[PDB]
Each structure stands twice: as C-alpha cells, then as structure tokens.
C-alpha cells in the first residue's frame, strides 16, 4: 500500500517517462521534461495512493507535444511550468497560501 | 468409389489459415486438434464439437489489420462535417491519429466519455469510426446480469458459443475494430457473478493483451482495439474500473 | 431481452414474440404503466428499456436469443403513466409528453 | 411421411423465406446454420437446438 | 474441477492444463482478484478454492 511523493518522483523519472516515451515514439531530445515539472505534477494534479493516474497525466503531455510537432510548428516542445497550464488544463488542488512574516 | 471428406476439411481449414500470421500459441493447438479431428468416424457425436471448434479457431483473424488512414488534414473535414462544438473530444482524436502516424504500427487505447444526457456521446462514435477508418461495432451493456456474454462457455455444454467480443471480432474481419461499450454505469449487480467484475480483466491497459474467454481457450490479444464507453454519471462505476480508463468530459 | 440460447429453455424477449405473433413489422406496441417498473433488487429493467426507445439507435436492436440485429425503427410505441416525475431522467428525455 | 428429417426440413425453411425481403446481412447467418444442420446428425441434442 | 470424463467432450479442470503446459510440478500460480467470486447457484466455486 501507499506511496510517498518522493517514491512517486523516483518511479516516474526512471520507469514511466522512458516507457511512455518509447510508446509514443518521440525522440528524447524533442520533448524535454524537467524534473521540476514532474514535481509540480505530482504535487498539484496527481495526488492519490495509486500510480496509474500519474501515468495518464504524463502520457497526456507527451501526446499534446506529439500533435504539436508532427503537424504544427515548433521543432522542440519545451515543457515549462509557466506554460504547463495549457498542456494539462485546469489544476485541481489549489496550493496552500504562503505567508511571509 | 470413395472420396476423402476428412482430407477435404483437413485441407480447407489449412487453406483458410494460410494467409494469416498465426501466433505460435495457436499453431500447435490447432494442429493437435486437427489430428484428433482426423481420427474419429464422421458421424461420431463428439466429432461435431471438434469440427465446430476448428470452425471458430481458424475463423477469427490473427493479425489481419484494417489499415487505418494516417494523415490528419483530410480527417479533420470528415470529423467536423456532421457535429459541432465538442472541441475537446475532437482534439483527443486528432492527438491519437497524429501519434499513430508518428510511431508507425497502429495502436489502441481506452476512453470513457461522460456528461448530461443528449449531448451527443453516442452519435459521435460512428463518425470516429468513419474518420480513423477502422470498422465499427456496438455493444450495449445496459442492465446485463450474465457474465457469459463477456466470457462464453466451456464447450462441453451443448450449444456453447464464445462471449460476445469474439463474435464481434469475427463479424468484422479486421483485428482492431472500434468496440463501443455503452451505458457502462448502468450495468447491473446480477446477484451471482455480477458482470462488472469480469470487465476488469478486459480493460487493463497492459494485461489486456492476454484475454482468456472460455470457449476457444487460447489467449487472444486485444491491445489494438479502441474501446469507448459512455456514462450518464460517474459515481456508480466500481472504483478500479473507474481507474482503468481516461475520463474525457463532454 | 431473452436468454443466451445455450441454456435449456431460452426464448427471445417479449418484443420478438410480439413481432412474430403479428405478421407486420410495425405493430402499435403499447407499453403500459411505465411509472411502476420494478427497481433496486436486481438490474434495473429501465436500463434495458433505453435500448428500445432511443428514436434512432433502436434501428439496430439486438435481442440476445437471435443475435442478428433486428431493425424495428418503424414501430409506433406508446406509453401511459399517470405522474411524470418518477421516470428516470435519461429515459424521460427520449419520449415526448402529451397531456390529456 | 409424418416425420421429416433433413431434405424437406431445409426445403420448407428455404421456401418460407421467399415472400419476405430479408436484409442481406442475415442470409449469411442462415446459410451457415443450414449447412451445419445438413452435416449434423438427426439425433443429438445439438440438432434440435439448432 | 473439470467434468466427469463420461460426458461427450469432457476436459480436465483448468489447473491440470496449467501443469501440462508449464510442464513442471512447482509453478507460481497466481490467482487474481480473489474477492470477486460469485459463489451462487449450483456452484460455490469458493468451496473448491478452499
Ligand atoms: N453537437 C451535436 N450536433 C448535432 N446533433 C447532436 C449534437 N449532439 C447531440 N446531437 C444529437 O443527439 C442525437 C443522439 O445523441 P446521443 O445519443 O449522443 O445522446 P446521448 O447524449 O447519447 O444520450 P444518452 O447518453 O443518455 O444515451 C443525434 O440525433 C444527434 O443529432
Ligand atoms: Mg447515448
């Protein structure tokens, strides 16, 4: 049972992402996914005891990049947190407010 | 004065099986069964069951693939020609056709639309089948309460037939039709082996490749198939089955 | 919807018996008292009824006994319930009301 | 001949179809069932069901 | 549990197929989703499982 967010990040970085990447055929150079983005995805959108839902999320971003490259314009999609909102849609879990003082 | 009916069937099955790329799991079973069919006297009551068994086992396509259109430009027009709005669903199907063009070999998925009634969830499936060009089917599961439809029967029972999925996969010669399960969330609890359990074996994204319906006992791959569902509301569905499938929202 | 035909006594569902007993393909079937169908102890019969009453989709009705699809789009259903609230929403949408 | 067996049973079925205009789909199904009935024995639980 | 071997077409229960196919007496059989068994009319497979 269970999965701490740290384990989910390690698993996503060494098992899921390469596997989904081979499944969709994108060259590794063509669609970078920074580990910071994976942290953001684990924290905001996919937050539950299973692992499947995280797989669907990362698979979604890779699909959108694929359609953007094969027919669109950019020769290298570059996921960044600033742009991430348009790839994965509206975030579910709002971040807690951060007071400074 | 005598002919060779046994050789007639023993060759005609062979001839239908020639062009298919038959997996090694099957070839040995079909061969030993074909010999067992060759021994017995023609009228013997068991012999019929085997002539039937082979009649199913050699019929279902083994790798024959209805080639699917790849370029997305032409696909746009036929997708938009008889619906409007629903942009998110059309964006998904465009993503899918694109990736299929990129990786080469055709490959499937699982999807599950859901929304308020009458939005168009059920009339689009036929249009998608016309766009990607893979052959269509439809499979209502409203109110069903008998697992046999998804899993067939054991073949010693008289008149056993394989579960409805194999009948689909034979009726359309292709190997990767667009199955369309329908009204998944109204599937009943049948007070003995409620069907909702059996579907779990069918929809695993990875384990699906070894479906094991009882009648023809050799496992059949199904990964190429493109299932779709529909659900008026997404609460009734049992939790693991809710988890297997993507949830687009019209 | 009948049974699977590999059982002992399987017979096609009630509608196909209707459609054989009256030689025409377009009888005026009169489902009656739709409000008081059973519910909540086995699979809802209502969940089967939708497959009949969809105005277009019914053209490929598929009775389990004789699995080959049975076109029946020409039929003229009628229904008669005395209070139009209990009917579940997805089914209530299919069929236009007319208030006596 | 109060009890039929193979020939006449198929014959009366195939002729009963005539006035009807069957959709082209089901003629295949009826054809496999007929030929399978032709190869089947007159006494077995399979025959009466088919 | 198979059938009685006297019926037409009888075949042994599924586990013996597993032995004959794995061709060894110590396989790693993996029953799956144990809790969904139907345990109803004329069966009670849960009894055979015990
Ligand atoms: N965007 C649309 N454009 C044109 N027609 C539509 C659209 N959406 C729905 N329809 C109409 O809806 C009818 C069938 O809709 P559909 O069967 O998908 O309803 P539904 O949402 O499936 O209902 P339920 O899911 O309860 O069965 C078709 O006649 C079709 O014309
Ligand atoms: Mg619908």
Q: What angle do CA B154, B159, B161 make, to 5 degrees?
A: 60
Give me the residues paired with residue A61 across strands.
none
Q: Which residues of E touch B154 (CB under 8 A)?
A: 11
Answer yes or no: do C43 and B190 touch at CB < 8 A. Answer: yes
CA of B122 to the centre of ligand 2 (A): 4
Cβ atoms within 10 A of the Cβ of D11, count? Answer: 11
Closest residue by CA, ligand 1 atom 2: B83
- Secondary structure of residue D22 in the 3-state scheme: coil
Query: Residue A77: in which H helix or E strand, if any?
Result: strand A77-78
**Ligand sitting nearest the alpha carbon of B186:** 1
Separation of alpha carbons C72 and C58, rounded Å: 7
Given the structure tokens 């529909």, which residue do they identify? B230
Is there a binding annotation on residue B115?
yes
Closest CA to B228 of B94, B80, B108: B108
d(CA B140, CA B144): 9
User: What phi and psi, each to the nearest 5 degrees, are found at residue D27?
Assistant: -65, -35
What resolution in angstroms, rounded to 1 decimal? Answer: 3.8
Q: How far is the CA of B124 from the centre of ligand 1 (A)?
A: 8
- Which of C68, C71, C73 is the best substitution to test chain D (most D C-beta atoms within 10 A)? C68
Compute φ and ψ for A77, nearest 5 degrees.
-65, 145
Q: Which residue has the tokens 């023809």?
A: B216
Phi then psi for residue B131, to 5 deg, are -80, -60
Residue B97 and residue A71: Cα distance in Å, rounded?
11
Taking a C-beta distance cutoff of 8 angstroms, is the pair A44, A93 a contact? yes
Chain B residue with the nearest C-alpha to that of D25: B171
Instruction: Report the Cα B4 to chain-centroid distance in Å.
Output: 36
User: Which candidate, B241, B163, B232, B165, places its Cα nearest to that of B203?
Assistant: B241
CA distances from C86 to B159, C42, C83, C95 (A): 41, 18, 7, 14
| Cβ contact B–D (≥3 pairs, < 8 Å) | yes
Q: Which helix (H) or strand (E) holds E48?
A: helix E45-49
Taking CA–CA distances from D28, the nearest residue in chain B reads: B171
Task: Give, to the nearest 10 degrees, the angle between helix B72-80 and helix A52-71.
Answer: 110
SS (HEC) of chain C: CCCCCCCCCCCCCHHHHHHHHCCCCCCCCECCCHHHCCCCCCCCCHHHHHHHHCCCHHHHECCCCCCCCECCCCCCCECCCCCCCCCCHHHHHHCCCCCC
- Euclidean distance between CA atoms D34 and D16, whole angstroms: 14
User: Rounded CA gap, E5 and E2, in Å?
Assistant: 8
Query: CA-to-CA distance for E37 and B198, rounded, in angstroms?
Result: 10
Phi, psi for residue C78 in degrees, rounded to 5: -145, 155
Write out chain B residues lying below 8 Å of A26, CB-based: 102
The number of the ligand nearest the C-alpha atom of B115 reads 1
Give the span between the Cα atoms of B55 and B49, in whole angstroms: 10
CA separation for the pair B121, B85 (Å, rounded): 12
Task: Record the tokens describing residue A37, joined without a space.
Answer: 């983005």
Residue C5 contacts residue C65 (beta carbons within 8 Å): yes
Cα–Cα separations (whole angstroms), residue E13 to B28, B50, B156, B219, E19: 20, 19, 12, 17, 11
Given phi > 0 = left and psi -120 to 50 = alpha, else beta, which region is C53? alpha
State phi, psi for B139 to the nearest 5 degrees.
-155, 90
Helix (H) or strand (E) holding A39: helix A35-44
Q: Is B122 annotated as a binding residue?
A: yes
Give, in order, the Cα–Cα distances in Å from B71 to each of A70, B76, D7: 10, 9, 55
B139: which strand partners? Answer: B181
Q: What's the N-to-C CA distance of chain B in angstroms?
A: 70
Contacts of C80 (CB under 8 A, 6+ apart): C30, C32, C33, C34
**DSSP letter (8 states) at residue A78:** E
- Per residue, the 3-state secondary structure of chain B, as one string, reads CCCCHHHHHHHHHHHHHHCCCCCHHHHHHHHHHHHHHHHCCCCCHHHHHHHHHHHHHCCCCCCCCCCCCCCHHHHHHHHHCCCCCCHHHHHHHHHHHHHHHHHCCCCCEECCCCCCCCCCCCCHHHHHHHHHCCCECCEECCCCCCCHHHHCCCCCCCCCCCCHHHHHHHHCCCCCCECCEECHHHCCCCCCCCHHHHHHHHCCCCHHHHECCCCCCCCECCCCCEECCCCCCCCCCCHHHHHHCCCCCC
> Which of B146, B218, B150, B153 is closest to B179 using CA atoms?
B150
- Index of the ligand 1 atom closest to the CA of residue C93: 26
Please report where in the chains the tokens 């929202």 appear, as a residue. Answer: B249
Any binding-site annotation on B119? Answer: yes
- The shortest C-alpha distance from D20 to chain B (Å) reads 24
Distance E7 CA to ligand 2 centre (A): 45
Task: Compute the distance between CA of residue B166 and CA of residue B180 in angstroms, rounded to an integer.
Answer: 14
Write C58-64 long-range contacts (CB < 8 A, 24+).
C60/B138, C61/C15, C62/B140, C63/C1, C63/C2, C63/C12, C63/C13, C63/C15, C63/C16, C64/B149, C64/C1, C64/C2, C64/C3, C64/C4, C64/C5, C64/C12, C64/C13
Please name the residue ranges forming H helices in chain D.
7-16, 24-39, 45-49
B250 lines ligand 1 (CB under 6 A): no
Residue from B120, B141, B142, B185 whose mutation best tests the ligand 1 pocket (most atoms within 8 A of CB): B120
Among the listed residues A37, A94, A36, A27, the one whose alpha carbon sits nearest the alpha carbon of residue A61: A37
Chain B residue at shortest CA distance from E10:
B156
Check if B61 has its Cβ closer than 6 Å to any atom of ligand 1. no
Token couple for D30: 């009826």
B155: closest CA of chain E, how far (Å): 8
**What approach was used to elucidate this structure?**
cryo-EM
Largest CA distance in chain B: 72
Using a 10 angstrom Cβ sphere, with 0-12 exposed, 13-18 middle and 19 or more buried, the burial of residue A62 is buried
* Chain A residue with minimum CA distance to B96: A63
Quote the minimal CA–CA distance from B202 to chain D in Å. 27
State the smallest CA–CA distance between residue C47 and chain B in angstroms.
5
SS3 A31: strand
CA distance B4 to C45: 53
- In this structure, the number of other CB atoms found within 10 A of the CB of residue D22 comes to 10
Tell whether residue B159 is among the known ligand binding residues: no
Q: Quickly count: other Cβ atoms within 10 Å of residue A71's Cβ.
A: 14
Q: Determine which residue's CA is closest to atom 10 belonging to ligand 1.
A: B120
């Amino acid at each position: 049972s269970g999965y701490v967010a740290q384990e989910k990040l390690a698993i996503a970085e060494r098992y899921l992402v390469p596997q989904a990447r081979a499944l969709c055929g994108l060259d590794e150079s063509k669609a970078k996914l920074s580990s910071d983005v994976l942290t953001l995805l684990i924290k905001q959108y996919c937050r539950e005891s299973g692992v499947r839902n995280l797989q669907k999320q990362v698979e979604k971003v890779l699909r959108k990049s694929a359609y953007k490259i094969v027919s669109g314009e950019a020769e290298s999609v570059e996921v960044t947190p600033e742009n991430l909102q348009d790839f994965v849609g509206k975030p579910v879990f709002t971040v807690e407010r951060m007071y400074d003082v | 004065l005598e002919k060779d009916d046994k050789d007639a069937i023993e060759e005609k099955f062979r001839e239908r099986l020639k062009e298919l790329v038959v997996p090694k799991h099957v070839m040995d079973v079909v061969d030993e069964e074909l010999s067992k069919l060759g021994l017995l006297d023609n009228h013997s009551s068991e012999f019929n069951v085997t002539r039937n068994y082979l009649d199913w086992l050699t019929s279902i396509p083994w790798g024959k693939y209805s080639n699917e259109n790849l370029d997305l430009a032409r696909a746009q027009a036929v997708l938009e020609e008889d619906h409007y709005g629903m942009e998110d669903v059309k964006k998904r199907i465009l993503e899918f056709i694109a990736v299929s063009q990129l990786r080469g070999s055709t490959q499937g998925k699982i999807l599950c639309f859901y929304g308020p009634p009458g939005v168009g969830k059920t009339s689009i499936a036929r249009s998608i089948a016309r766009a990607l060009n893979r052959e269509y089917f439809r499979f209502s599961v409203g109110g069903m309460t008998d697992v046999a439809e998804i899993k067939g029967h054991r073949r010693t029972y008289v008149g056993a037939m394989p579960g409805k999925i194999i009948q689909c996969l034979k009726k359309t010669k292709t190997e990767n039709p667009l199955i369309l399960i329908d009204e998944v969330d109204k599937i009943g609890r049948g007070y003995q082996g409620d069907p909702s359990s059996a579907l779990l074996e069918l929809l695993d994204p990875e384990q699906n490749a070894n479906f094991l319906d009882h009648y023809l006992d050799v496992p059949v791959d199904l990964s190429k198939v493109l299932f779709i569902c529909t659900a008026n509301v997404t609460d009734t569905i049992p939790e693991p089955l809710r988890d297997r499938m993507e949830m687009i929202n019209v």
